[PDB]
């Protein structure tokens, strides 16, 4: 079993591929732009990936990796009811370039399943796009489309840290994502099956993508404060969290 | 604190950078070239590095990382008394290109301290260069020069696995390297402090470098069968739990 893991208590490391408006400052990863006064911008799109590709599975041995990632994000919308568009943790093709903005979170182009996109993402959607989204803000699992194959309601604690945990169990093909707002004591979780070897390439770049609205006040910040990741290609979370995120 | 680790029970992944004659076959890392019949070549030079850079220290916070690496190597010299030149575990500048061959193991150019080399290595020297080496085969700690700052005698169990453990304790600035030949039940060790922040860049590539002789039958194989590495970089200016490490990763 090949194992690998990284843990960043803070950023500002040559370990990231920054695209769009993504930037590092105050040792935190700011995916979308924030003006001098500290307020969010419109039409922003930023992505950040770990500089080295991760092998998700091995075509020749049929082996499929199990992995887990955790990060703390902070989303602040000056006008809560105007929050848009969200942040997503994504697994994309290695040289991948940004996709459509706003509602597509920079990782997808349509709400129609397109295997050629070779992209899977867990989204934290703050703006309800009526053509495809649920009524409220939500956590969703996106498989080669912006229309989640499964979602769960999420109560956004504006400007409050969100502690996220995403795991993939190759044995059950189950992808689980949970979000906790320690300040409001709330927690959410979503789980669905994903046939990984069929939706993604053998090697992918893991990272984040975020965007803001295009109309006057539909914007918010999208900051990541810490990030851990562990992969095992042929996972004991109990020791993972302790020796990596806690 | 930032942490990084990996463990390879066999090679195959494209998480390795190969230079010179370095190659992967039979799921093992072969640093120096071998002929169809399985015999070593002359004037061979091969290097292999983890594709991702490791941060050894943080200039702005004064923090210095503690790390450990373990790997199993197998060195086979058709003619034992003709064994040359050796294999080295090295920390080099990220885009680093191979250096001098043969006695310099592909990581150094002279036996004169040159800080600009920005390279540290732990060598497993099978051939004695009278110009700077000790009389017998040895393990040595090289700091920006091929002339080790400290060495220890090593009894080469030809063609037998060598289990190596190298650790760096930022608290004591001590670098320790040990080698064990389980089949012959022998073991060796060396230690010396190294002011890491002064000999290397903030980010380095870790890996292996090996070479063979230029003269006659002075050659041998340089194969790596497995490799683990773990690093821990604090938030401010503490050793590492080698036990937990060694269990869930090597033993
Ligand atoms: C947060 O965003 C809301 C939706 O954009 C704002 O309400 C909207 O304000 C517009 C002027 O900026 C106005 O044309 C819309 O009719 C109105 N829409 C709704 C559904 O209320 C809201 O702005 C404040 O409240 C409105 C009603 C006006 O009084 C504005 O002058 C105010 O800025 C925003 N809320 C806050 C607390 O800023
Ligand atoms: Ca949306
Ligand atoms: Ca020598
Ligand atoms: Mn959605
Ligand atoms: Mn020597």
Curated annotation (Swiss-Prot), chain A:
Keywords: Calcium, Glycoprotein, Lectin, Mannose-binding, Signal. Gene3D superfamilies: 2.60.120.200. Leu-235 is missing in a major portion of the beta subunit, suggesting an origin by sequential removal of amino acids rather than a processing by endoproteolytic cleavage. Disulfide bonds: none annotated. One of its GO terms (molecular function) is D-mannose binding. Belongs to the leguminous lectin family. This is Lectin DB58. The keyword Transport does not apply. Pfam families: Lectin_legB. Heterodimer, composed of an alpha and a beta subunit derived from a single precursor. InterPro entries: ConA-like_dom_sf, L-lectin, Lectin_LegA_CS, Lectin_legB_Mn/Ca_BS, Legume_lectin_dom, Leguminous_Lectin. It comes from Vigna unguiculata subsp. cylindrica (Horse gram). Metalloglycoprotein, containing Ca, Mg, Mn, and Zn and the carbohydrates galactose, glucosamine, mannose, and fucose. It agglutinates erythrocytes of blood group A1. Glycans are attached at residues 12, 79.
